[PDB]
């Protein structure tokens, strides 16, 4: 189904509409409390050992 | 809020207050409490 008839968005180049039509792969999280690992880091987490 | 906010917002009017007949009939329950206490304690020389 079409998103205009189902989600019924507002029209315009708003910040939410830009990510809705084309999401970016360069997602920035907040890093004030936790610094992320490098993306694609594999392996079973060390937190189980802790 | 409902207690003093209603007085301060002007929502407590004479037309919204209970009537004097309502206050008379509600306040008649005071004699019921007195006679209930006198029935429970029976602290009288009233029987003679």
């Amino acid at each position: 189904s079409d998103a205009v008839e189902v989600f019924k968005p507002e029209t315009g180049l708003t910040p939410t509409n830009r990510l809705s039509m084309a999401p970016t792969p360069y997602i920035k999280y907040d890093e004030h409390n936790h610094k992320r690992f490098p993306p694609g880091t594999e392996g079973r987490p060390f937190a189980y050992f802790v | 809020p409902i207690g003093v906010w209603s007085v301060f917002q002007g929502y407590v009017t004479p037309a919204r207050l209970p009537s004097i007949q309502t206050l008379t009939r509600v306040g008649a329950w005071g004699g019921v409490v007195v006679v209930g206490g006198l029935y429970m304690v029976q602290p009288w020389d009233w029987l003679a």
């Binding site: - | 809020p1 207690g3 003093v4 906010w5 301060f8």
Partner: protein, 376 residues
């Protein structure tokens, strides 16, 4: 799906696992879980102590000593009970001060505040009659002084006093009935706590911002279980220190003397958590007026959700007056432990007057002015 098949799984899941909770709750919202844990601790250690205590005036002190020395783990249980009462009162007082700071009793949470005030009154009575059970000098003489306040009521004062005592003085029937009432009242506290918590789950908690939080809610069980565990461990550290290193720090040395009705101590004082009420009573040189002032304090506590305006951080005048109220109640706590003196009488009178002024004048009127400042 599995909790949809049994009622008891469904109620537990709804109210403990998947209950929505504001995501910005700080560590001031841990006092309730800590108070519940301290009630459970008091009930467990009291049930265990009741298997060795004897509620008779010839065997009460001796059974306390025998439990201390001869019963395995009896000293841990007895010190845990006696200091868990003080930690219970610390956690509950901080919980109430949180509610006073944020104005958490306001609409639609009037029932929560009223059931809280009921809980606090039951807690006070429970601790007071539990302190009489060791039958020491403070245990005897405090029960004598406090239950003699009934004679301030005219005509039928002495009759109620003798009915509560079971005789002409505090003696063995008083101790036996106090033991039964003391065993009984914690279960009423558990029921009241269940009702109090189920009243809050109708609308949810307030947040530190003081705004509506229905847009940002997360599950209680996954997130706030660990956050409550952290505070429980900080409380367990203080509990361990008080039980093992300083066991008689929050007590009185006169309660280790056996009770003597023919020689009173020089300084009859209660436990620390009843000292502000005692200071309010001692500051007024009239017994009826002192009892009335205590009753008016608790009436003002009941009337807080209907006369109180003014809440958290963004309401700054009442937020500043909160710290003056806190200093006043701690000054009342300190004044209760000191002897009667003209300057302590004057300072206690002024402190009681300021407590009444804050409760009945600042909270309605200053709250209304700051609502008119912010939204008028």
């Amino acid at each position: 799906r599995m909790h949809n098949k049994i009622q008891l799984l469904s109620v537990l899941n709804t109210h403990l696992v998947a209950y929505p909770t504001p995501m910005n709750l700080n560590y001031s919202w841990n006092g309730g879980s800590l108070a519940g844990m301290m009630l459970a601790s008091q009930m467990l250690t009291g049930i265990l102590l009741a298997m060795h205590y004897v509620g008779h005036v010839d065997y009460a002190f001796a059974s306390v000593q025998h439990l201390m020395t001869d019963v395995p783990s009896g000293m841990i249980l007895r010190y845990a009970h006696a200091n868990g009462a003080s930690l219970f009162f610390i956690v509950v007082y901080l919980h109430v001060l949180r509610g006073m700071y944020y104005g958490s009793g306001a609409q639609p949470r009037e029932i929560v505040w009223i059931s809280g005030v009921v809980i606090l009154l039951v807690m006070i009575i429970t601790a007071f009659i539990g302190y009489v059970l060791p039958w020491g000098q403070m245990s005897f003489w405090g029960a004598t002084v406090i239950t003699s306040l009934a004679t301030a009521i005219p005509v039928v004062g002495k009759h109620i006093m003798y009915w509560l005592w079971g005789g002409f003085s505090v003696d063995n029937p008083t101790l036996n009935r106090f033991y039964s009432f003391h065993y009984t009242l914690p279960f009423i506290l558990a029921g009241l706590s269940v009702f109090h918590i189920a009243a809050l789950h109708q609308y949810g908690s307030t947040n530190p911002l003081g705004v509506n939080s229905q847009s940002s809610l997360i599950s209680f069980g996954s997130y706030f279980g660990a956050k409550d565990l952290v505070g429980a461990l900080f409380l367990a550290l203080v509990f361990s220190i008080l039980v093992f290193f300083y066991p008689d720090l929050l007590g009185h040395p006169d309660n280790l003397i056996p009770a003597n009705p023919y020689s009173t101590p020089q300084h009859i004082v209660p436990e620390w958590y009843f000292l502000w009420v005692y200071a309010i009573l001692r500051s007024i040189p009239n017994k009826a007026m002192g009892v009335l002032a205590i009753g008016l304090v608790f009436a003002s506590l009941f009337a807080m959700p209907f006369i109180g305006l003014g809440g958290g951080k963004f309401r700054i005048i009442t937020e500043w007056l909160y710290w003056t109220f806190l200093a006043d109640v701690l000054l009342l706590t300190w004044l209760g432990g000191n002897e009667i003196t003209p300057i302590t009488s004057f300072v206690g009178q002024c402190c009681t007057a300021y407590l009444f002024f804050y409760l009945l004048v600042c909270q309605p009127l200053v709250g209304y002015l700051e609502t008119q400042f912010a939204h008028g």
